[PDB]
Amino acid sequence: STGSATTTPIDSLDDAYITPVQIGTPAQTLNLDFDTGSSDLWVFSSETTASEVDGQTIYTPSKSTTAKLLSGATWSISYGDGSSSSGDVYTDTVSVGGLTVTGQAVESAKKVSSSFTEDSTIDGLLGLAFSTLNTVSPTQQKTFFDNAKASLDSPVFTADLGYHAPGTYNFGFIDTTAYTGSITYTAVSTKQGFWEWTSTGYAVGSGTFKSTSIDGIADTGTTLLYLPATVVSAYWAQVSGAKSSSSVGGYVFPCSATLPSFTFGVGSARIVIPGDYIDFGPISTGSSSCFGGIQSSAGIGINIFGDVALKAAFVVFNGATTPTLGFASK
């Protein structure tokens, strides 16, 4: 089997992407944030504290003839941005772009933190990291991809995120029309549960490529590109007036600037992030200070190849017995 679904930016900045997902019988369609940095499929639901729902579409398990309470199971998750959610668990039928999994753990939120409430466009998350990170207790649950893998034509999914435009998540096949040149594959460590890999270096604008190993994670659920402070300083030093602002929480730059591109290495190959992809717009409405899309990871503990980087590429998440990542230009 295969599946193919369009993923759409939630706003004019590409802060996140939502993909429609059918849950239950009859189908209830929710728009979920596909997140290769986590491993829980959780939804706003009829069980979510009413004051914490503000415009999201909810899953109502009592209206699904295929929903079954996973008795005793609870979940609770905290994300790198400080947001969180928790609740109980049903199993139900879940379909993405025509690919159907029966018995998928659907984690029903009883509580969500304010950032989720405040984002009316995201009805939940669909985790695509390794199932070892799934938070369901006492019986850890598998991701949608893990459950689907055996049925897929090939044990892969691909992320093709758009810049200010829709893109595609495919399951079970590699669309050879969706990228240019060849796909370069690189090793993955699953030791932390992430799609963790080592970039071979970087370049700023037309500058020379610096060969240096940068370990990080391919994370569709993180907006920006988070890299070591040395690398980020070298990038922003090429932008007149750019500075790190403790009050804003990162590098800002004059909105009048034209940003240089940023290149990252995948083996001997190179992925170029156009400068425009690094512009996240005014820090507050009407400001002439703009927020940068490349930020330091120094306070995180891990480097994160988030959407800023991934949307410059066609990305293969290869879930073969030894997982690997593939990147192609597009």
From Swiss-Prot:
Keyword terms, alphabetized: Aspartyl protease, Disulfide bond, Hydrolase, Protease, Signal, Zymogen
Domain of life, source organism: Eukaryota
Gene Ontology MF terms: aspartic-type endopeptidase activity
Biological processes per GO annotation: proteolysis
Reaction catalysed by this enzyme: Hydrolysis of proteins with specificity similar to that of pepsin A, prefers hydrophobic residues at P1 and P1', but does not cleave 14-Ala-|-Leu-15 in the B chain of insulin or Z-Glu-Tyr. Clots milk
Annotated catalytic residues: D35, S199
Domain (Peptidase A1): residue spans on this chain: 17-328
Disulfide bonds: C255-C290
EC number from the UniProt entry: 3.4.23.22
Family: Belongs to the peptidase A1 family.
Protein's name in the database: Endothiapepsin
Organism expressing this protein natively: Cryphonectria parasitica
